[PDB]
Design an enzyme around this catalytic site. Structure first.
Site, short mmCIF file in Angstrom:
data_model
loop_
_atom_site.label_atom_id
_atom_site.label_comp_id
_atom_site.label_asym_id
_atom_site.label_seq_id
_atom_site.Cartn_x
_atom_site.Cartn_y
_atom_site.Cartn_z
CD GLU A 1 -2.25 1.74 2.50
OE1 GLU A 1 -1.52 2.71 2.77
OE2 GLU A 1 -3.16 1.33 3.27
CG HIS A 2 3.72 2.49 2.90
ND1 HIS A 2 4.35 3.52 3.55
CD2 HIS A 2 2.74 2.06 3.73
CE1 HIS A 2 3.79 3.71 4.73
NE2 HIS A 2 2.81 2.84 4.86
CD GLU B 1 2.81 5.34 7.73
OE1 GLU B 1 2.59 4.13 7.50
OE2 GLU B 1 2.37 6.27 7.00
#
Ligand SMILES: CSC1=N[C@@](C)(c2ccccc2)C(=O)N1Nc1ccccc1
Lengths: 54, 443
Positions: free
Chosen positions: B59-60, B136
């Site tokens: 997703e990154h 994160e």
């Protein structure tokens, strides 16, 4: 921890564990721990040979 | 124009399937703007001990460029047309979607396909994101609410796949290989397990066409077009307690196993949750709120906030509540909360469900407020129910619910069940599991 139910249950268990000997003694050997001398009315003039306490 | 009528006049959702197995769905309106995206049936649940957090790692990179167009190029092109590119990855579902002018619906579809099929996975970009993801994880670690829900899954589904967090482990993030991500993408981002959804002012036939053109690469074998059924995740009545009296407030989450998407009972559980509702210190309503629990919270200052939830999944789910409170009001809050849950199974009223049903209707209507949310509904519906479910159907189902039905369903999933508990922060006042378990009956 809260006394209930941890120790309420633990204590009821302890109760019935110690209640067995009590009742066994009480119902199967009522006089195991008592002096037979106490089945004789008190006589102020005669002292029992062996005066021993409970 | 009555509520009923408006529901019937809503444009239908069109679905068509390509030969490769991909499904294309869309709801048409008259908006110059639109949202289109691909909803994939993938997530952490599909990962395992070695590749946990790969779907997140992906997703990154899904936005750092493809083969046909490197980073800068990919970005400039999307930016320069005023389109928004977002996405997300959860436990059972992933999604990459774009917001833009219907006038570009086709260019976008090409962009999407390029993202899900030809991710560059730049060896250097990977090491760069490895450090970003690690930052994160430390940021999210301060999100008590999310730490709490992660823990709730960690224990409620301990030993299984749903026990893992979406972001993954530190070890995995530190060792995932360019090959692993590659493998992930290939193994999961596959036509039959995806859905091209779009909403706004778009031609279903024009959408499906651009779809045929870019979403191709058909499969040869049978193992490539079959959607793998996942192994069941065992629910466990238990608790995980993370204590830190240094934290200002405590978070608590309690839950029982839920049915799973396909089950009709979910309509009732949602009505149920509607009765209990939710609350937070900024609800003007105050002591007059309909939700009993909320009213008590206000009167006795039981918490900063609380919320109910019915998190569904393919074969299971989590039905419970979550609250935040000061260390000294946790016990009363939990008491009142479990109390309301008992009231549900035992004494729900017709008036209660009437209100909750209305609240629930406007809730479902609110989840279709914009192109993105409607597009999200479609992606999810086909992916979970294998078909779109109209507001009119929902409303049909919601209308059939009555007090008795609520009591029966709630009694079914709640009454005398062993819950899953997660508590974080200054939780000394929260009583033990046994006491909480007893709050599960009589009420
Ligand atoms: C009324 S006699 C008596 N009372 C008892 C139950 C008792 C004494 C002292 C303290 C508590 C209980 C006991 O053992 N005796 N017997 C006895 C026999 C010989 C010598 C002393 C006492």
């Amino acid at each position: 921890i809260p006394f209930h139910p941890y120790y309420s249950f633990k204590d009821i268990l302890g109760l019935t564990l110690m209640l067995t000997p009590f009742l066994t003694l009480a119902l199967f050997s009522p006089n195991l721990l008592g002096d037979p001398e106490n089945f004789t009315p008190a006589n102020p003039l005669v002292t029992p040979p062996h005066i021993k306490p409970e | 124009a009555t509520y009923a009528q408006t529901l019937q006049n809503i444009p239908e959702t069109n679905v068509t399937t390509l030969d490769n197995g991909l499904r294309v769905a869309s709801e048409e309106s008259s908006q110059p703007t639109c949202t289109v995206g691909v909803w994939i049936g993938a997530g952490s649940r599909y990962e395992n001990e070695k590749n946990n957090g790969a779907g997140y790692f992906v997703e990154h990179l899904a936005f750092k460029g493809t083969k046909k167009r490197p980073c800068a190029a990919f970005e400039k092109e999307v930016e320069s047309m005023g389109a928004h590119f977002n996405g997300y990855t959860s436990r059972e579902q992933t999604a990459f979607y774009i917001k833009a002018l219907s006038k570009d619906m086709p260019k976008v579809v090409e962009l999407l396909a390029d993202v899900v099929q030809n991710c560059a996975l730049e060896e250097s970009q990977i090491e760069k994101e490895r450090g970003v993801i690690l930052q994160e994880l430390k940021e999210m670690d301060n999100d008590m609410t999310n730490v709490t829900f992660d823990y709730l899954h960690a224990t409620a589904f301990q030993g299984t796949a749903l026990a893992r967090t979406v972001e993954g482990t530190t070890e995995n993030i530190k060792h995932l290989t360019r090959a692993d991500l590659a493998s992930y993408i290939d193994t999961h981002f596959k036509a039959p397990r995806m859905v091209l959804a779009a909403a706004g002012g778009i031609s279903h036939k024009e959408l499906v066409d651009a779809a045929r053109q870019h979403f191709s690469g058909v499969s040869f074998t049978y193992k490539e077009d079959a959607v793998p059924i996942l192994p069941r995740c065992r629910f466990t009545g238990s608790e995980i307690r993370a204590r830190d009296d240094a934290l200002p407030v405590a978070h608590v989450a309690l839950a029982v196993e839920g049915p799973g998407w396909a089950d009709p009972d979910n309509v009732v559980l949602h009505v149920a949750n509607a009765i209990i509702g939710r609350y937070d210190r900024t609800f003007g309503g105050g002591k007059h709120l309909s939700s009993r629990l909320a009213a008590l919270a206000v009167e006795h200052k039981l918490c900063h906030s609380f919320q109910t939830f019915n998190t569904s999944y393919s074969d299971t789910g989590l039905f419970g509540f979550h609250f935040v409170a000061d260390p000294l009001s946790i016990d009363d809050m939990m008491f009142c909360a479990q109390g309301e849950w008992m009231r549900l199974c035992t004494s729900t009223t017709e008036s209660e469900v009437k209100r909750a049903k209305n609240h629930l209707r406007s809730a479902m209507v609110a989840q279709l407020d914009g192109t993105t949310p409607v597009c999200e509904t479609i992606g999810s519906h086909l992916l979970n129910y294998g078909r779109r479910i109209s507001l009119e159907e929902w409303d049909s189902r919601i209308s059939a619910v009555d007090a008795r039905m609520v009591r029966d369903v709630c009694s079914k999933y709640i009454y005398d069940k062993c819950p899953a508990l997660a508590a974080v922060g200054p939780i000394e006042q929260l009583l033990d599991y046994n006491r909480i378990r007893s709050g599960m009956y009589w009420i």
